Write a protein that binds this ligand. Structure first.
Ligand SMILES: CNCc1ccc(-c2[nH]c3cc(F)cc4c3c2CCNC4=O)cc1
Ligand SMILES: [Zn+2]
Length: 197
């Protein structure tokens, strides 16, 4: 079902997606332990993810949410890092793998590409701060609907949870959904973290 369409660096769609990647990098409280030490990425490839069934599933649910929330899907574009990115682009998101988490900060999602807290890092060097091995992240279209505000299935009468960072100073929000149909994996981004100079 799924085809991946390569986007050219000269395409405005490539450029807008890359800019969201780069401009949402932040410093983390672990000093780079989980995701590595970097201020920007080397973008190697951006692919548009096209799948008819997963898209129709996304839009059907989006309409339901919208009608339960004064015609407002509250749709966002958010990052998702996972060792299971290949399964996600072909089979879509699945809540049973308790919710499904998404980040406004690309560098937050980058912490989860090799597993929880970075796991043991890249397969070949076992380095969580590897500047060599290629990483992959999803930039996803996400339906939040009526989102339950959390100061840091979904709560009754809500479609999602918003984790508003209270303690952290420069952190952006993180979101949780409980229905896999409320997220569509729209862009597959292949990159390296870049060593600072
Ligand atoms: C549920 N098992 C523990 C657990 C493991 C990972 C995550 C988690 N929190 C996130 C916040 C965020 F902004 C983005 C992500 C995550 C994840 C893992 C899923 N991917 C994310 O990018 C949450 C809970
Ligand atoms: Zn490596």
């Amino acid at each position: 079902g799924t085809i991946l369409i390569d986007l050219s660096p000269d395409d405005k769609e490539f450029q807008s997606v890359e800019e969201e990647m780069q401009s949402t990098v932040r410093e983390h409280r672990d000093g780079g332990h989980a995701g590595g030490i970097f201020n920007r990425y080397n973008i190697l490839k951006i692919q548009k993810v096209c799948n008819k069934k997963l898209w129709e599933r996304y839009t059907h649910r989006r309409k339901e949410v919208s009608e339960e929330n004064h015609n407002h899907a509250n749709e966002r574009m958010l990052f998702h890092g996972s060792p299971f990115v290949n399964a996600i682009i072909h089979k879509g998101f699945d809540e049973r793998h308790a919710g499904i988490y998404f980040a406004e900060n690309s560098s937050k999602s980058n912490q989860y590409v090799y597993g929880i807290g970075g796991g043991t890092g890249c397969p070949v060097h076992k380095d969580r701060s590897c500047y060599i091995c290629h990483r992959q992240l999803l930039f996803c279209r996400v339906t939040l609907g009526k989102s339950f505000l959390q100061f840091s299935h979904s709560p009754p009468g809500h479609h999602s949870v918003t984790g508003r960072p209270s303690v952290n100073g420069l952190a952006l929000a993180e979101y949780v959904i409980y229905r896999g149909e409320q997220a569509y994996p729209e862009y597959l981004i292949t990159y390296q973290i870049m060593r600072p100079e």
